[PDB]
Amino acid sequence: SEEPPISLDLTXHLAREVLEMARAEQLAQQAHSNRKLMEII
């Protein structure tokens, strides 16, 4: 903690990558995995 939050601020934009993409891949894996498993039950 010395320099300004430049990397944090820019990460704000890129949150639509590491949080949107990550969250999507989780919802997608856990949509189709869950759907394939649940389709069996």
CSV table of C-alpha atoms in Angstrom, one decimal:
chain,number,residue,atom,x,y,z
A,1,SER,CA,0.0,0.0,0.0
A,2,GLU,CA,1.9,3.0,-1.3
A,3,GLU,CA,1.0,3.7,-5.0
A,4,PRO,CA,-2.6,4.5,-6.0
A,5,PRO,CA,-5.1,1.7,-6.9
A,6,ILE,CA,-4.2,1.7,-10.6
A,7,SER,CA,-4.2,-2.1,-11.0
A,8,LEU,CA,-7.4,-2.4,-8.9
A,9,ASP,CA,-9.2,0.3,-10.9
A,10,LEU,CA,-8.3,-1.2,-14.3
A,11,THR,CA,-9.2,-4.6,-12.8
A,12,UNK,CA,-12.7,-3.1,-12.4
A,13,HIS,CA,-13.1,-3.2,-16.2
A,14,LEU,CA,-11.5,-6.7,-16.4
A,15,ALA,CA,-13.9,-8.0,-13.6
A,16,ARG,CA,-16.2,-8.5,-16.6
A,17,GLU,CA,-13.5,-11.2,-17.6
A,18,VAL,CA,-12.3,-12.8,-14.3
A,19,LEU,CA,-15.8,-12.6,-12.7
A,20,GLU,CA,-18.2,-12.6,-15.7
A,21,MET,CA,-16.2,-15.3,-17.6
A,22,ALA,CA,-15.3,-17.2,-14.5
A,23,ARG,CA,-18.9,-17.0,-13.1
A,24,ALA,CA,-20.3,-18.0,-16.5
A,25,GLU,CA,-18.0,-21.0,-16.9
A,26,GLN,CA,-19.1,-22.0,-13.4
A,27,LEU,CA,-22.8,-21.5,-14.2
A,28,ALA,CA,-22.3,-23.3,-17.5
A,29,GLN,CA,-20.3,-26.3,-16.2
A,30,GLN,CA,-22.8,-26.4,-13.3
A,31,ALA,CA,-25.8,-26.0,-15.7
A,32,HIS,CA,-24.8,-28.8,-18.1
A,33,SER,CA,-23.1,-31.0,-15.6
A,34,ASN,CA,-26.1,-30.5,-13.2
A,35,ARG,CA,-28.6,-30.9,-16.1
A,36,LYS,CA,-26.9,-34.1,-17.3
A,37,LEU,CA,-26.8,-35.6,-13.8
A,38,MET,CA,-30.3,-34.4,-13.0
A,39,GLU,CA,-31.6,-35.5,-16.4
A,40,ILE,CA,-30.6,-39.0,-15.1
A,41,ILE,CA,-32.5,-38.5,-11.8
